[PDB]
Design a protein around this ligand. Structure first.
Ligand SMILES: *[C@@H]1O[C@H](CO)[C@@H](O[C@@H]2O[C@H](CO)[C@@H](O)[C@H](O)[C@H]2NC(C)=O)[C@H](O)[C@H]1NC(C)=O
Ligand SMILES: *[C@@H]1O[C@H](CO)[C@@H](O[C@@H]2O[C@H](CO)[C@@H](O)[C@H](O)[C@H]2NC(C)=O)[C@H](O)[C@H]1NC(C)=O
Ligand SMILES: *[C@@H]1O[C@H](CO)[C@@H](O[C@@H]2O[C@H](CO)[C@@H](O)[C@H](O)[C@H]2NC(C)=O)[C@H](O)[C@H]1NC(C)=O
Ligand SMILES: *[C@@H]1O[C@H](CO)[C@@H](O[C@@H]2O[C@H](CO)[C@@H](O)[C@H](O)[C@H]2NC(C)=O)[C@H](O)[C@H]1NC(C)=O
Ligand SMILES: *[C@@H]1O[C@H](CO)[C@@H](O[C@@H]2O[C@H](CO)[C@@H](O)[C@H](O)[C@H]2NC(C)=O)[C@H](O)[C@H]1NC(C)=O
Ligand SMILES: *[C@@H]1O[C@H](CO)[C@@H](O)[C@H](O)[C@H]1NC(C)=O
Ligand SMILES: *[C@@H]1O[C@H](CO)[C@@H](O)[C@H](O)[C@H]1NC(C)=O
Ligand SMILES: *[C@@H]1O[C@H](CO)[C@@H](O)[C@H](O)[C@H]1NC(C)=O
Ligand SMILES: *[C@@H]1O[C@H](CO)[C@@H](O)[C@H](O)[C@H]1NC(C)=O
Ligand SMILES: *[C@@H]1O[C@H](CO)[C@@H](O)[C@H](O)[C@H]1NC(C)=O
Ligand SMILES: *[C@@H]1O[C@H](CO)[C@@H](O)[C@H](O)[C@H]1NC(C)=O
Ligand SMILES: *[C@@H]1O[C@H](CO)[C@@H](O)[C@H](O)[C@H]1NC(C)=O
Ligand SMILES: *[C@@H]1O[C@H](CO)[C@@H](O)[C@H](O)[C@H]1NC(C)=O
Ligand SMILES: *[C@@H]1O[C@H](CO)[C@@H](O)[C@H](O)[C@H]1NC(C)=O
Ligand SMILES: *[C@@H]1O[C@H](CO)[C@@H](O)[C@H](O)[C@H]1NC(C)=O
Ligand SMILES: CN1CCC[C@H]1c1cccnc1
Ligand SMILES: CN1CCC[C@H]1c1cccnc1
Ligand SMILES: CN1CCC[C@H]1c1cccnc1
Ligand SMILES: CN1CCC[C@H]1c1cccnc1
Ligand SMILES: CN1CCC[C@H]1c1cccnc1
Lengths: 206, 121, 206, 206, 121, 121, 206, 206, 121, 121
């Protein structure tokens, strides 16, 4: 069949360590957006917020294009982890002993190389809970995502609005919003700007 | 099927002539492959003769051809060209093309081979 | 012997990344059914339900057929994880730090390619415990299973009735039923419907 | 030396996925016996029993025979995990988040292929603690071992009496016995009987 | 045993003739294999001559055979056929078949080889 | 040492005769190995001639030998036999045995090779 | 493109087990400096201090040099873990069950082989908390970093001043300083001196 | 350089599965000794003792010898885990859920093949805490080390005195000694004696 | 491109003469490569003739050349030299250079090959 | 460098004579290597002639040499010896030694090869 030819052909000359860009002097464009599912817990003795999230990263490969008229029937291909270049996007402020709680899944590609990656996770961020208005409070918590190695001139991260559409209402805390913002910062280690995306969850006490 | 590469322009010419070996391609996306020219003598093995990357400007020639032969490609007509000048008596062998997925032109993992052609000096 | 020839022949041209379907323009059919064994715990301060389960998935390969008259004696072959295509079926609403608690085991195949996969697990789902009728309550908890990458036009999941036949009665909570239902949903990320199977455990307080 | 020739010769034509039996239409014979070392804890709020155990499995390979007169000096060979076929024997009723707490070690073979495998572990079974005679009780706890994939017509498990000879007496609970029994059960998934071995620990309160 | 592939239809014919090389198979399930025809000259190496996938319609011919020869298969009689037309004085070599487990016809990991046959022009 | 395989029974015979090529083995456990007969022509490469698995009944012959030659083994005397009947003028080459650890007779990883023998027709 | 040629050329003759030095009779020079981000917790019943840190080490390879005029566009290359030699720098006094909580990331190299490695981590050190002045105390905690195998005559570690610039102030404890000092000690196991770097966090109670 | 030739040469014909002994009919000699660093905790409700230890085992390979006059500059080579034969020494009486808490590190070999292995770990032993003299007690805890597979006629373990020289005094419990003793025991599984080394920590309450 | 190695100094000389085969390099950093000289006879295969590591002092010669030929390198002019003395009648073959990334001179993974040259005795 | 293996003792002798082929070694620790003798005919490939393990007593000979030739080693003088007796007309070829790190004598991964020698009968 043709699905067995496609997989043998797409990986002829592929180096998982190379940025899949046509002109190697231009930055790739990754699209980032998270999707909340539930506010599992908000600890106050410590300062930690546990949530269920689905990350959404979308880029455009250039070495995984074929012709659906030559390979009839096949219109998408799924690549496991470790065989295709994937962005290294981490959570800067995390309180998990492992520092990374994402559960790796397959990367989905279509006839034009537009790759999609939606890892689920149970993320334990680090927030600041204020109880100076114990009866009523509008707490704001931050989630800061960004690329660790690639940054600036290489991987121009872009933000997409969050998707609160499967949210399951919590008991004590109620959501008020989850705005997002994109920033560019300079660090002491290197001399090239690094972008980042910050999402601000607003939970009001009931 | 229909992944066919057809060569043309062979023949015989005295020392110090000219040739315009050409190779047309069909059946695959010609803009995602880097053609390489190979030459085999009757009593020898395969040898490089030129190579061009898929981007368009990566020409790599051989040491003994560096100054004489010139390689070129045309994506609009799905063709490759190997202009040969100042031919010498030991440039007698079969010339054929070999494609390869996105690559530089230098050693790679070739996929689609071509047909033979005869050039005599 | 013939088992050593069978194992050397069955993996001549096999790509673990390929859907084992004959006509690559048709969807494969997977059969899903869970088997409960015990309700280990039902937390109420948090909202979590811990159970012991055996998943049951059955598909039909097409590249693992042989003739028992040519290979006498051999009537079944067992393949480990990472050498045969296995469906990626996850539990959507999980409260485990790893998000996947299944213990991978072998896949069993017979002379016609009918594969069986029964991973055991101790699953920690997320439920909603209501205590407005503390003396008597009929709590309903949900378990939602589905394919992550493959969905719609590719993997037509089907449901089979649960199997409460080795259940060990609990102390405080008693079972009343575990019905199942199959649904098809549209997500914002893609444009193709995704199926899912939901099992509803009904636990009544004693 | 000869120990370097033996290891290069024994693994010439070996497939770690093959049941090492001479006549592939007959069942292999495995010998199972556990060895207790200490009753580490007996939880009562929950229902769990933590113990320290050494499993003992013994089969007879057929592809690892040599002649000690041709390979002088070498009388035993030790194979790590993943290079020699090992039975997949699990604990059916486990309360550990991983479902398998065994620490894999080497398999020991002698000049006739009689393999020995003694994995140690700290097992957390699931028991039923009755406190209706709180002052005095004779609690019985069960440990059920069996093969997951291989069973019936393939791997005829056999039992050997437990070995309480290094037991370190506990403080509150005192042992009275650890009898064993072998049973043959039919499951709904398949149609071929599966054997199992059950050990009953009897702990009396002090 | 009994995994036997037997070819027939060889012989000698003048330039511009016809031939109906056939190959019967036995001992294995003929519907789970893709036959491929190979040709070897007395002083050369193996070369592709055709190929058909197990499904039934995946014919892949060679560049120097695209327009002349035609490959076909019959699952009911467990046979393969390679109709040869407009033979040239260069098509002189031993032709033999090679099966392979589920495959496309293009390069695979062949399992069962066949016996040689002689065709002269 | 002492892992020695010794051939015998070679010679010359006219077309349509008989032969009883034999091979004795020593130095290794003869009951844990599957002997395979190989034939090499003066101007060709190695080719299968027969094969028997260690169990005792797995005989695999070649396509062009299927009906003429018969292979057998004797564990009591540590010997292998290849009875040859209806010899043709093509069966002229060196025949030698090759053992292999527990195997089927078909392609394996051979360990102990044997010595050559001459058979002419 | 040239990024695919560079990755294929840089790893022609590379042995990840070799010290990347020109004259093998001279010591390599590694540069070490940590960066604090938050004092997550300071336990007192036990003696443990949990912090969020970014290690910073920077050596200079000699086998990863190229010419940016011959490979236009490519000015940096990122190598995953397991393919380029990385120093083995551990925390001598750790209280984590794994003894190493660093999250491995890529190593960044530029046109001259100057490598950078900045692993993040949530480190659990071991401190001595004194409460003889409960209202006011100036507790000092120590973090000792050093190479395990390489030491002396091989890897001349050097220290760089800490970087408290993204510090997020804590609630109860306030920072006063984090000085560093380099020492050279002799151990009983070997006879060659081993260097180490010690950082002293000075937390005052509020 | 020569460090690359040495690494390419030392692993020409090496089988990590073979005992590095010259005459395969004689036992190898391993030297064992632990080094304490701190008594992290002594639980009394349960029976567990947590310590910070450095193991020290030394053997003599015979296949890793070279000539420093032919390979000038190179006087030591470090091999990671999985490429050189290392003794399998475990702690018989462990209370850790994994049964092995050692953190694997490199093996350091010199010009004569004398290897050294010093894995650090946070070991959770199992003790018997007696409180019949609560004001003053001299508790004794045991740590039993030994080889799992290799034992007797193969690996003649030998003991070296412990090294309490970096000990950091604890608060409540004060050390009095850590004697060691070597014993040879017969087990029921096999018929060849197995050696072991037992260290007795003496902790007196303050 | 422009990764070119050009040899020179070939010719013919009677037994017991002298030669100064040289090879210039261009297109790559000459200080990160170890040149190795290879010799191929008309009816034989490739063979070592000498080798020098990138550092500068690692000369490894062959057993049959140990005392006659001497290899040297010049990083300032991007050249390699193979002085040949006391040539014998058996030293007739094509000599060409081969570079390799950081290496010792002994067997390695060569990257850039050179052009042939003819020396006759 | 200086890892040199030098052969000696070649020549010509009538059928049924004697020979004492010897091979001296230098440059490497001779007590950590197992020498193996290889023989190559003018129109054939390499073949085993003998082998001795590093320990001192592991001699493995070939099937066609088992009774005639005898291999030995001397660690004090860094030499190997292959006494040849009852030479026969087909024992004409180049004999050379090959070392290998700690090994048995049977197939290993050889490191240092030697020089050729001529023996004619
Ligand atoms: C494969 O996916 C791409 C990306 O979604 C499709 O191309 C367009 O992508 C843009 C976003 O960059 C969408 O806004 C368009 O709607 C997409 N075109 C569509 C949906 O027709 C592309 O069409 C997909 N399929 C193929 C065969 O290319
Ligand atoms: C192998 O398994 C298949 C699947 O169970 C058997 O084929 C039939 O499968 C259907 C379900 O799709 C069952 O309802 C039938 O009972 C099965 N046939 C039987 C049990 O005879 C198949 O028979 C099994 N064995 C072989 C040799 O094919
Ligand atoms: C190798 O182990 C086997 C198995 O223990 C030994 O063979 C006999 O095995 C039975 C159990 O099936 C024991 O009851 C016998 O005592 C064993 N024979 C003995 C101990 O002599 C075998 O002897 C062992 N060694 C060799 C060289 O075979
Ligand atoms: C690659 O990185 C190195 C190291 O940073 C740069 O070389 C100099 O390195 C020193 C530190 O050892 C700095 O103080 C200098 O500022 C660096 N030179 C600069 C920044 O020009 C080197 O320049 C970097 N880039 C290249 C192409 O070499
Ligand atoms: C390599 O290590 C060995 C082992 O330490 C050194 O050889 C001697 O080993 C014994 C212990 O078995 C020590 O008591 C001696 O002091 C060691 N000799 C010394 C230190 O000179 C050996 O010297 C070390 N180095 C070399 C080059 O062999
Ligand atoms: C890549 O981009 C550069 C500048 O952006 C341009 O000069 C060049 O032509 C582009 N294509 C290449 C380098 O192949
Ligand atoms: C895909 O193949 C068809 C038929 O071979 C061809 O007409 C079409 O142009 C190809 N696609 C593109 C983008 O050229
Ligand atoms: C596969 O299915 C399609 C439509 O369902 C049909 O046209 C085709 O003949 C089938 N077989 C193939 C494509 O081999
Ligand atoms: C299996 O083999 C037997 C004998 O070779 C044959 O009769 C039978 O038809 C084969 N199976 C099928 C499905 O054809
Ligand atoms: C294997 O066992 C079967 C029945 O148990 C018997 O018929 C056969 O002869 C035995 N040996 C084989 C199949 O080689
Ligand atoms: C082992 O070898 C010796 C000598 O080669 C032989 O006498 C003995 O019979 C062999 N073992 C068996 C079981 O035959
Ligand atoms: C390396 O250093 C030594 C002494 O430090 C010196 O003699 C030598 O020339 C240097 N270079 C080498 C060894 O290549
Ligand atoms: C890099 O290449 C350019 C052009 O090939 C050359 O001029 C330059 O000298 C090279 N770099 C170095 C350090 O020599
Ligand atoms: C090895 O030791 C045995 C006895 O200990 C001895 O007989 C033998 O000669 C030694 N050397 C060997 C076996 O090569
Ligand atoms: C090491 O090499 C030197 C010079 O090659 C030599 O003199 C010395 O003897 C060698 N070492 C040993 C132990 O022989
Ligand atoms: C971009 N990262 C964010 C903080 C560290 C920095 C970095 C820079 C270079 C290599 N790794 C990490
Ligand atoms: C919404 N989908 C189903 C769950 C995961 C998600 C998805 C979609 C496409 C590719 N990967 C994941
Ligand atoms: C009921 N069986 C025994 C326990 C697991 C289960 C099973 C059956 C077939 C294949 N895998 C698992
Ligand atoms: C340098 N390290 C510090 C403590 C252990 C010591 C060491 C020495 C040799 C090999 N491994 C570790
Ligand atoms: C020392 N080991 C642990 C206890 C038994 C012994 C052993 C014997 C055989 C195989 N593994 C382990």
């Amino acid at each position: 069949e043709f699905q067995r030819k496609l997989y043998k052909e797409l990986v002829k000359n592929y180096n998982p360590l190379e940025r899949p860009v046509a002109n190697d002097s231009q930055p790739l464009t990754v699209y980032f957006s998270l999707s909340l599912l539930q506010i599992m817990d908000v600890d106050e003795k410590n300062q930690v917020l546990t949530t269920n999230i689905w990350l959404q990263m979308s880029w455009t490969d250039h070495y995984l294009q074929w012709n659906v008229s030559e390979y009839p029937g096949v219109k998408t291909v799924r690549f496991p982890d470790g065989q295709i270049w994937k962005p290294d996007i981490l959570l800067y402020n995390s309180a998990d002993e492992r520092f990374d709680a994402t559960f790796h899944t397959n990367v989905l590609v279509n006839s034009s190389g537009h790759c999609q990656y939606l890892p689920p996770g149970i993320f334990k961020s680090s927030c600041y809970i204020d109880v100076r208005w114990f009866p009523f409070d509008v707490q704001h918590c931050k989630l800061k995502f960004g690329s660790w190695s690639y940054g600036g001139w290489s991987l121009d991260l872009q933000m997409q609005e969050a998707d609160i559409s499967g949210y399951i209402p919590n008991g004590e805390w109620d959501l008020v919003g989850i705005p997002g913002k994109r920033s560019e910062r300079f660090y002491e280690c290197c001399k090239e700007p690094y972008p980042d995306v910050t999402f601000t969850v607003t939970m009001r006490r009931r | 099927a229909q992944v066919q590469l057809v060569e043309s322009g062979g023949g015989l010419v005295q020392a110090g002539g000219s040739l315009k070996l050409s190779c047309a391609a069909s059946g695959f996306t010609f803009a995602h492959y880097a053609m390489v020219w190979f030459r085999q003598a009757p009593g020898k093995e395969r040898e490089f003769v030129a190579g061009i990357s898929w981007s368009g400007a990566s020409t790599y020639y051989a040491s003994s051809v560096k100054g004489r032969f010139t390689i070129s490609r045309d994506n609009a007509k799905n063709t490759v060209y190997l202009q040969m000048n100042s031919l010498k008596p030991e440039d007698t062998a079969v010339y054929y093309v070999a494609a390869a997925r996105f690559g530089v032109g230098v050693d790679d993992d070739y996929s689609y081979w071509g047909q033979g052609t005869q050039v005599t000096v």
